[PDB]
């Protein structure tokens, strides 16, 4: 690589990658472990305009990488001694989409809705996220609005159900600020056909019954966007051979 390309890769590692790795290695959602990544620290890195990443891109790559809405669009034409690493472009666009959806205020925060679904052998369901409760009884579904994160002394998410043949059983109890994200990960997820900004969620309970819900988002994938951080790696280079 040229020394301009090389010193830019080195600046990228020292100014951004090393401290991202120190802050988020061996932490949920990056790794499926009990220890949680700090949401305010994650905001300090990926914030749309003030984030450490956005500031690095603006200070060092303003001539070859440009903003277009929530996207970063490359332009290495006329800079023939530079070819972007595709993993770099993909990583920054993944983080920009997460920031656009979940960090609009400069901190973690979004709103979404849930509607309890129906399934054979399921009489009642209870979903809780950050002390916000959705209790489904009498085959009477309602859309309920939720905040994530929500201020509470009990952060986390839980899911329980009453089958037609047994008393209440607990599906999962996931404490901490990422509780909702940990719960969503366990569901079978897909676009809900015929539901605007809708996603079907289906948790296979311990008795084999399906715990169904519809998620409705305000922008993009809503809270599902945070699942893009599962096994996410910030690349060590901006430019490649």
């Amino acid at each position, epitope marked *: 690589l040229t020394p301009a390309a090389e010193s830019l890769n080195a600046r990228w590692r020292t100014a951004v990658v090393d401290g991202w790795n120190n802050a988020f290695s061996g932490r949920y959602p990056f790794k499926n472990v009990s220890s949680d990544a700090s949401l305010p620290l994650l905001a300090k890195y990926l914030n749309t305009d003030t984030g450490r990443i956005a500031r690095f891109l603006q200070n060092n790559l303003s001539g070859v990488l440009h903003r277009e809405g929530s996207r970063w669009v490359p332009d290495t034409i006329n800079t023939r001694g530079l070819t972007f690493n595709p993993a770099f472009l993909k990583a920054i666009n993944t983080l920009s989409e997460i920031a656009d959806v979940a960090f609009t205020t400069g901190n973690a925060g979004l709103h979404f809705e849930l*509607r309890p*679904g129906t*399934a054979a052998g399921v009489m009642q369901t209870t979903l809780i996220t950050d002390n916000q409760k959705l209790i489904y009884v009498n085959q009477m579904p309602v859309w309920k609005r939720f905040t994530w994160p929500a201020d509470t002394e009990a952060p986390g998410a839980s899911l329980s159900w009453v089958s037609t043949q047994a008393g209440t059983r607990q599906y999962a109890d996931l404490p901490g600020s990422w509780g909702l994200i940990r719960l969503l990960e366990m569901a079978r997820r897909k676009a*809900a056909p*015929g*539901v605007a*900004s809708g996603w*079907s969620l289906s948790w296979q309970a311990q008795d084999g019954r399906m715990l*169904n819900y*519809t998620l409705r988002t305000e922008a993009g994938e809503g809270p599902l966007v945070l699942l893009k951080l599962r096994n996410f790696v910030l690349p060590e280079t901006v430019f490649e051979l």
Partner: nanobody, 129 residues
Framework: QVQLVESGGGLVQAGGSLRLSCAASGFTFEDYAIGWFRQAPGKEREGVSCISNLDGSTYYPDSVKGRFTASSDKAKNMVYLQMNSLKPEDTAVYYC??????????????????????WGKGTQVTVSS
């Protein structure tokens, strides 16, 4: 309060036709989608049709597609289910149900896991051979 009153049920010979009516009241008709569902003994309730008064979308599962037609009459606030070429598999209690049509379009998901907002009491349909 929403009211959904089904009528037109009864005994019909296999190969015959039957027209079901769902008299709707207590909601802004244009804002809702109406689903027809059926439940027979030893069977889970299943959706057979969806019609949205809001966008005009319709859905029918393959079991009844081409044989059953749902139509909406804004002048009378009624939804019909025209059932042709009736089979013994069509015997069940038929229910009409309503769901807010804002933000949706008729699909298998709507009359599947999504859930309805209001339900009628149902009408018996018996196909005799």
């Amino acid at each position: 309060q929403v009211q959904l009153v089904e009528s037109g049920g009864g005994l019909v010979q296999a190969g015959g036709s039957l027209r079901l009516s769902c008299a709707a009241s207590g909601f802004t008709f244009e804002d809702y989608a109406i689903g027809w569902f059926r439940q027979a003994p030893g069977k889970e309730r299943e959706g057979v049709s969806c019609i949205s008064n809001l966008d005009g979308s319709t859905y029918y599962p393959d079991s009844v597609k081409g044989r059953f037609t749902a139509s909406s009459d804004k002048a009378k606030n009624m939804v019909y289910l025209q059932m042709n070429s009736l089979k013994p598999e069509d015997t069940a209690v038929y229910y009409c149900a309503a769901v807010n049509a804002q933000g949706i379009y008729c699909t298998d998901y709507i009359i599947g896991p999504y859930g309805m907002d209001y339900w009628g009491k149902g009408t018996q349909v018996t196909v005799s051979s």
